[PDB]
Design a protein around this ligand. Structure first.
Ligand code: HEC
Length: 119
């Protein structure tokens, strides 16, 4: 539904904290390590990157929904603002988020870009 080409450019806003790197080490987008690798994130189980120290809130969503993977819809909501997304799922207004960056536009496009590299 989104446009991956605009998504790729907008992802510049994410790359301070996230890379897109394939399992063989191929860099699609070089980025930081503060947040998890986002290669393959679309259709991935929520908070499931081994070795990453996730916050308590996103782990609670995964524990409550053990089979739940990132849908495009959920990704669009989460990247808009992680906090209300966690609050809705956990029912805890104090739910912890390690990510507070907000993307108020072009969300579907960034998600389309990520989907192109979630083969
Ligand atoms: C650092 C300041 C960040 C920026 C800028 C962006 N994100 Fe992020 N992200 C960050 C952290 C520390 C975490 C872990 C969250 C937690 O509470 O543990 C995340 C997480 C995500 C996820 C979920 C990944 C998973 O494996 O489940 C996604 C899908 C995600 N981030 C996407 C994303 C995008 C698209 C960004 C730019 C618009 C972006 N993040 C910015 C840290 C940081």
């Amino acid at each position: 539904e989104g446009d991956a080409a605009k998504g790729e450019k907008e992802f510049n806003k994410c790359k301070a904290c996230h890379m897109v790197q394939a399992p063989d080490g191929t860099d699609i987008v070089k980025g930081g390590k503060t947040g998890p690798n986002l290669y393959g994130v679309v259709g991935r189980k929520i908070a499931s990157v081994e070795g990453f120290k996730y916050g308590d809130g996103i782990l609670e969503v995964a524990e409550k929904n053990p089979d739940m993977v990132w849908s495009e819809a959920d990704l669009i909501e989460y990247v808009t603002d992680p906090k209300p997304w966690l609050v809705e799922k956990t029912g805890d207004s104090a739910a912890k988020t390690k990510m507070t960056f907000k993307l108020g536009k072009n969300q579907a496009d960034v998600v389309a870009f990520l989907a192109q590299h979630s083969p």
